[PDB]
Design a protein around this ligand. Structure first.
Ligand SMILES: Nc1nc2c(ncn2[C@H]2C[C@H](O)[C@@H](COP(=O)(O)OP(=O)(O)OP(=O)(O)O)O2)c(=O)[nH]1
Ligand SMILES: [Cl-]
Ligand SMILES: [Mg+2]
Ligand code: NA
Ligand code: NA
Ligand code: NA
Length: 326
DNA sequence: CCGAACAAGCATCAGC
DNA sequence: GCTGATGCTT
DNA sequence: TTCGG
């Protein structure tokens, strides 16, 4: 991490704008600048050198100059001293609490973890589980544990129905040595863009993973998206493992390639690629890539038989998952 | 200067 | 109940 | 906050 100091500052600014100012485009600007700088293979010596990078503008170059000169950013130092900003930033670290709820809680005087714990009755279900596992969800997952989790998920899925295909995506598929959570893409031949021939396809999998005590809690659940909590089993007299966030996404079987591109990410990579798609005259979601008409309206889905097919449409060279961590 | 900035599932709420 | 907007999340 | 046009 050549420029870790700069990218930390930009990320802290990103988080301030999202959580406190509720300024989504400022948030995206700082996040993109941090991503482009994190990829940059030289130690940055000035804001002017940084300003040559796409996504670093005048204002960010000035902050980089102040940071390189002093090691600090005065703007951030004040933000950390502001109690309301500090408390709002803190509360958004609970899963289910965003900037609106965080500011509403602070208004009601709920400003600390203890404050939250004694006010469980003011939390919705998602927020309540996020508070329950607050510390655990802060811990990263070593890839060695990701492998054990993969093995459990893929084998339990096979026991429900041998025609399910479960793929672990996210940072795991990009080869990361540690992950924030586990992301499972799920397909079954009975669920295509053309019909749903069996009900409960996601439910059956969730229920099986609950039965074997792998899934421990649910944050949200519908017919195609599950967001929840899981935990590896531990040996006799060993510590328990931390509880972990798990997302499962059932995708139409014929739309796997758009689905695995979406769920492999990164999130910034997806934003970058979807923005370039638009400039090339296409729109990409997790299901399809479609041409944009002369008006702007999305046309019919184009045929896709590999992830690389999607890169070709927008005239991008293919990038392996490992080169998509932006 | 100024408009666009990725795309969408689930939970929750207001209004009907 | 349903529809649409908003929050929060991937 | 940044960029393209
Ligand atoms: N198009 C789009 N996709 C997103 C967005 N956020 C997340 N995703 C997709 C790409 C992610 O790689 C993938 C999983 O979301 P995660 O939050 O788990 O990110 P990821 O696994 O990459 O990193 P992690 O190690 O879990 O912190 O979902 C988004 O804002 N837009
Ligand atoms: Cl903004
Ligand atoms: Mg993940
Ligand atoms: Na630039
Ligand atoms: Na949060
Ligand atoms: Na995830």
């Amino acid at each position: 991490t050549l420029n870790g100091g700069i990218t930390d500052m930009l990320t802290e600014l990103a988080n301030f704008e999202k959580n406190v100012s509720q300024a989504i485009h400022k948030y995206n600007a700082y996040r993109k600048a941090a991503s482009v700088i994190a990829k940059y293979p030289h130690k940055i010596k000035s804001g002017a050198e940084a300003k040559k990078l796409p996504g670093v503008g005048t204002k960010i170059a000035e902050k980089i100059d102040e940071f390189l000169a002093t090691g600090k950013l005065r703007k951030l130092e004040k933000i950390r001293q502001d109690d309301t900003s500090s408390s709002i930033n803190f509360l958004t670290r609970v899963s289910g609490i965003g900037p609106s709820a965080a500011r509403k809680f602070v208004d009601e005087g709920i400003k600390t973890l203890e404050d939250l714990r004694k006010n469980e009755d003011k939390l919705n279900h998602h927020q309540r589980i996020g508070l329950k596992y607050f510390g655990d969800f802060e811990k990263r997952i070593p890839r060695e544990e990701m492998l054990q989790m993969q093995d459990i998920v893929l084998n339990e899925v096979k026991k429900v129905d041998s025609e399910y295909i479960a793929t672990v995506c996210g940072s795991f598929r990009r080869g990361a040595e540690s992950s924030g959570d586990m992301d499972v893409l799920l397909t079954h031949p009975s669920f295509t863009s053309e019909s749903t021939k069996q009900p409960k396809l996601l439910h059956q999998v969730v229920e099986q993973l609950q039965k074997v005590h792998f899934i421990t809690d649910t944050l949200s659940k519908g017919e195609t998206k599950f967001m929840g909590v899981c935990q590896l089993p531990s040996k006799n007299d060993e510590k328990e493992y931390p509880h972990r966030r798990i997302d499962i996404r059932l995708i139409p079987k014929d739309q796997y390639y758009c689905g695995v591109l979406y769920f492999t990410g990164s999130d910034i990579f997806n934003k970058n690629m979807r923005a370039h798609a638009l400039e090339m005259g296409f729109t990409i979601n997790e299901y399809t890539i479609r041409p944009l008409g002369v008006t702007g309206v999305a046309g019919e889905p184009l045929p896709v038989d590999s992830e690389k097919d999607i890169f070709d449409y927008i005239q991008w060279k293919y990038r392996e998952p490992k080169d998509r961590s932006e």
